[PDB]
Motif scaffolding. Structure first.
Motif, short mmCIF file in Angstrom:
data_model
loop_
_atom_site.label_atom_id
_atom_site.label_comp_id
_atom_site.label_asym_id
_atom_site.label_seq_id
_atom_site.Cartn_x
_atom_site.Cartn_y
_atom_site.Cartn_z
N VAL A 28 -8.05 1.67 -2.99
CA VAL A 28 -7.80 2.75 -2.03
C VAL A 28 -6.71 2.34 -1.05
CG1 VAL A 28 -8.80 3.98 -0.09
CG2 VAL A 28 -10.03 3.88 -2.26
N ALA A 29 -6.78 1.12 -0.53
CA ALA A 29 -5.75 0.64 0.39
C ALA A 29 -4.39 0.56 -0.30
CB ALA A 29 -6.14 -0.72 0.96
N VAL A 30 -4.37 0.13 -1.56
CA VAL A 30 -3.11 0.00 -2.28
C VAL A 30 -2.47 1.37 -2.49
CG1 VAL A 30 -2.17 -0.46 -4.57
CG2 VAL A 30 -3.50 -2.22 -3.39
N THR A 31 -3.26 2.35 -2.94
CA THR A 31 -2.69 3.68 -3.15
C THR A 31 -2.32 4.35 -1.83
OG1 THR A 31 -3.01 5.81 -4.25
CG2 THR A 31 -4.93 4.82 -3.20
N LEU A 32 -3.03 4.03 -0.74
CA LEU A 32 -2.66 4.55 0.56
C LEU A 32 -1.32 3.98 1.02
CD1 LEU A 32 -3.31 6.24 3.04
CD2 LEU A 32 -4.67 4.33 3.92
N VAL A 33 -1.12 2.68 0.83
CA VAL A 33 0.16 2.06 1.18
C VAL A 33 1.28 2.64 0.32
CG1 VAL A 33 1.45 -0.10 1.15
CG2 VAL A 33 -0.85 -0.04 2.11
N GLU A 34 0.99 2.88 -0.96
CA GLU A 34 2.01 3.43 -1.85
C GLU A 34 2.35 4.87 -1.49
OE1 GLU A 34 0.68 2.97 -5.85
OE2 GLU A 34 1.10 0.82 -5.93
N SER A 35 1.38 5.64 -1.00
CA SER A 35 1.64 7.03 -0.65
C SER A 35 2.34 7.15 0.71
CB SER A 35 0.34 7.83 -0.65
OG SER A 35 -0.34 7.68 -1.88
N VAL A 36 1.96 6.31 1.67
CA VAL A 36 2.53 6.43 3.02
C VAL A 36 3.95 5.89 3.04
CG1 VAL A 36 2.35 5.60 5.38
CG2 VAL A 36 0.31 6.43 4.20
N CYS A 37 4.12 4.61 2.70
CA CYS A 37 5.43 3.97 2.70
C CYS A 37 5.62 3.20 1.40
CB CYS A 37 5.59 3.04 3.90
SG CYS A 37 4.18 1.96 4.22
N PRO A 38 6.37 3.76 0.44
CA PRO A 38 6.62 3.04 -0.82
C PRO A 38 7.59 1.89 -0.69
CG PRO A 38 7.82 5.11 -0.80
CD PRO A 38 6.98 5.10 0.45
N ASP A 39 8.11 1.60 0.50
CA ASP A 39 9.05 0.51 0.68
C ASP A 39 8.35 -0.84 0.49
OD1 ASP A 39 10.10 2.32 3.63
OD2 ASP A 39 10.51 2.74 1.52
N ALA A 40 9.15 -1.84 0.11
CA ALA A 40 8.61 -3.18 -0.12
C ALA A 40 9.50 -4.27 0.45
CB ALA A 40 8.40 -3.42 -1.62
N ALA A 41 10.36 -3.95 1.42
CA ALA A 41 11.24 -4.96 2.00
C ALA A 41 10.46 -5.94 2.86
CB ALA A 41 12.35 -4.29 2.80
N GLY A 42 9.43 -5.47 3.56
CA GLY A 42 8.63 -6.32 4.41
C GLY A 42 7.15 -6.19 4.14
N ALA A 43 6.78 -6.04 2.87
CA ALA A 43 5.39 -5.85 2.47
C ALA A 43 4.60 -7.15 2.39
CB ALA A 43 5.33 -5.12 1.13
N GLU A 44 5.12 -8.24 2.94
CA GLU A 44 4.39 -9.50 2.92
C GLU A 44 3.20 -9.45 3.87
OE1 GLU A 44 6.94 -12.63 4.22
OE2 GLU A 44 7.42 -11.69 6.14
N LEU A 45 2.15 -10.20 3.51
CA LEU A 45 0.96 -10.23 4.35
C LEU A 45 1.18 -11.03 5.63
CD1 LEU A 45 -1.85 -10.69 1.66
CD2 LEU A 45 -0.87 -8.59 2.60
N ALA A 46 2.12 -11.97 5.62
CA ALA A 46 2.42 -12.74 6.81
C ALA A 46 3.14 -11.87 7.84
CB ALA A 46 3.28 -13.96 6.46
N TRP A 47 2.58 -11.81 9.04
CA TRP A 47 3.15 -10.96 10.08
C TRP A 47 4.43 -11.58 10.62
CZ3 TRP A 47 1.14 -6.57 12.99
CH2 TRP A 47 0.06 -5.95 12.35
#
Lengths: 79, 534
Positions: A28-47
């Protein structure tokens, strides 16, 4: 009903509360992230640091607009 | 002369971390390079040219007989659309740089190889990272095509020339942050297919990664422009006989650096003649090499050479001076140098100079000597027998020096070859005609390509039109350019314009101005009866 693993065995004494499956909530979290912002430039878990937030302001603003246009997203976060 | 090669290919549309594409960054870098070179008080004679990745009739944007205005106008409107045809573009640029070489006398191929006849040129070849395409796939060799050679090009066998350096910029700017800023003063190489092609000419290939690194490489590139005298050195054949102050063991062997031949046109004599034995009857001439394969031998051999010989100061650019500095720059001693590949009839190399350093021990002076100095310097019928060891045509320049003393020679034996003179004027005329045809159709594009090519899948001849950018519809003259929405109002406007009977009527509805609006240009077409005497 979909994420809760079965379920129905009368856990505890009289207040059995079924836990949520981690895989279902992760999907659910993965599909929510994919629907809200499909970008992946800063999708790292490290803040990243604070100053790093001064470069991706457009993505943050579009995420805020998507959150303000549809409040259901917040409810999904509660899941 | 500087020829900027900006690909403007479809792969140069990806956006950097700053917000602009690679093409915009390349154009900005070119503009800052212009404003940096303008600081040096020597940019009043250079000429800028532009080369893009387009068709041979459309590759050149600004060439000969083109001022800075049209060059800036063409570089301004560069559009990144097309494949990465690096080989064809490099070939076109090299042919453009070699248009006025066979007509003025540079590289005559018959009378030595004069190093004081220079035509400097620096290529930047700003391209993308990698993955070049040739309309079929992705190659990884970068081989220059040979389909239509220029008349008179088989005598060099190489596209580039004596003074033609090739620097490269890849612009490998990251997209997220470009946070790689560990090494401050360090400019690594790109390590791509253009790196060997650049190293062969004599120029390195920078690897742009950050705007700070871009500024650093641009500030380091402006200090690498001077007279182009590029010669290649080899260690053979002395087995590193540098046993002067230590023991030898090296990478400073195949030095292909340049030399600064500063004038006092350049003034000098005693050129490197050739590398072969020229015969009296030779219809076909062996092709020369852009980089002369000249080798040095570490021998003292009386380094003190003092005479009334005309002096030369062809300064050598320090690139491999570590081997000389290891021996204390060889104080009061030198080492001979000789050109290989059958410099004489029957022998392997003839010492014709040395590499003695200056008193200040700053750089190498590159003392160029005659073909055989240790014999003519120290007549009892001796000079007549000595003049048989030197090449025939070589008696041309040296006799001029003899003019300082007398004139014992004549034009009796001043003949190179009866067949070398033939088939030379026709080649020069063909090269001049080709250069004229290239300089004629340099800016006139005349594309006239707007069609959709409607396929069947009035017959077999229909083609739908495309959207024209610079159409300029005549609303008052043509009635078809008036749409349906603003028709009645435009009708009344045309009626009032026609029934007004004003002066200097026009057919344009609202033509404000062009992109540029100069103040002096508009103020010149006026009259002001005032002088401000007070």
């Amino acid at each position: 009903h979909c994420c809760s693993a079965p379920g129905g065995t009368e856990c505890g004494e009289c207040w059995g509360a079924p836990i949520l499956s981690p895989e279902a909530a992760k999907a659910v979290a993965v599909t929510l992230v994919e629907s809200v912002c499909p970008d992946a430039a800063g999708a790292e878990l490290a803040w990243p640091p604070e100053e790093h937030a001064r470069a991706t302001v457009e993505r943050d603003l579009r995420i805020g607009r998507r959150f303000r246009e549809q409040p259901l997203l917040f409810e999904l976060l509660k899941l | 002369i500087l020829l900027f090669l900006i690909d403007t290919s479809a792969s140069m549309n990806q956006r950097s971390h700053l917000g602009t594409t690679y093409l915009d960054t390349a154009k900005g870098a070119v503009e800052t390079f212009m404003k940096l070179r303008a600081r040096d008080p020597a940019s009043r004679g250079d000429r800028y040219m532009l080369v893009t990745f387009e068709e041979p009739p459309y590759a050149i944007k600004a060439g000969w007989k083109e001022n800075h205005a049209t060059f800036m106008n063409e570089l301004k409107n560069l559009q990144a659309e097309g494949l990465t045809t690096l080989g064809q573009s490099l070939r076109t640029a090299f042919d453009l740089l070699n248009l006025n070489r066979l007509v003025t006398g540079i590289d005559n191929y018959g009378q030595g190889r004069n190093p004081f006849f220079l035509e400097p040129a620096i290529i930047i070849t700003i391209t993308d990272g990698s993955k070049l395409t040739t309309t079929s796939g992705v190659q990884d060799e970068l081989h220059l095509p040979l389909n239509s050679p220029l008349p008179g090009s088989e005598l060099t066998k190489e596209p580039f020339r004596w003074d033609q350096r090739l620097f490269a910029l890849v612009l490998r700017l990251p997209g997220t942050m470009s946070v790689e800023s560990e090494q401050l003063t360090g400019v690594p190489l790109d390590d791509s297919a253009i790196t060997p092609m650049c190293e062969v000419t004599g120029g390195r290939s920078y690897s742009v990664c950050s705007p700070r690194m871009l500024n650093q490489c641009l500030e380091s590139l402006v200090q690498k422009v001077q007279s182009g005298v590029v010669i290649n050195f080899e260690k053979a054949g002395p087995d590193p006989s540098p046993v002067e102050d230590g023991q030898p063991d090296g990478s400073q062997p195949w030095h292909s650096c340049h030399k600064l031949i500063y004038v006092r046109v350049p003034i000098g004599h005693w050129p490197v003649p050739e590398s072969f034995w020229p015969d009296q009857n030779s219809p076909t001439l062996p092709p020369r090499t852009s980089h002369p394969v000249v080798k040095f031998s570490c021998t003292d051999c009386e380094p003190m050479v003092i005479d009334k010989l005309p002096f030369d100061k062809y300064e050598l650019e320090p690139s491999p001076l570590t081997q000389f500095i290891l021996e204390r720059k060889s104080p009061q001693t030198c080492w001979q140098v000789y050109v290989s590949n059958s410099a004489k009839y029957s022998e392997l190399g003839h010492p014709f100079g040395y590499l003695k350093a200056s008193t200040a021990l700053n750089c190498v002076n590159l003392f160029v000597m005659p073909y055989n100095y240790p014999v003519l310097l120290p007549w009892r019928q001796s000079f007549e027998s000595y003049l048989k060891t030197m090449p025939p045509y070589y008696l041309g320049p040296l006799k001029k020096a003899v003019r300082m003393m007398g004139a014992p020679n004549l034009i009796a034996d001043s003949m190179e070859y009866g067949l070398s003179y033939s088939v030379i004027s026709y080649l020069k005329k063909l090269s001049q005609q080709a250069k004229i045809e290239s300089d004629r159709v340099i800016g006139s594009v005349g594309k006239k390509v707007v069609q959709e090519t409607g396929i069947k899948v009035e017959y077999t001849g229909f083609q739908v039109a495309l959207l024209n950018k610079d159409l300029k519809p005549q609303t008052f003259r043509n009635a078809y350019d008036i749409p349906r929405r603003n028709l009645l109002d435009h009708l009344t406007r045309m009626r009032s314009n026609l029934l007004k009977s004003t002066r200097r009527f026009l057919k344009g509805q609202d033509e404000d101005q062009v992109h540029s609006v100069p103040i002096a240009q508009m103020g010149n077409y006026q009259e002001y009866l005032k002088q401000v005497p007070s």
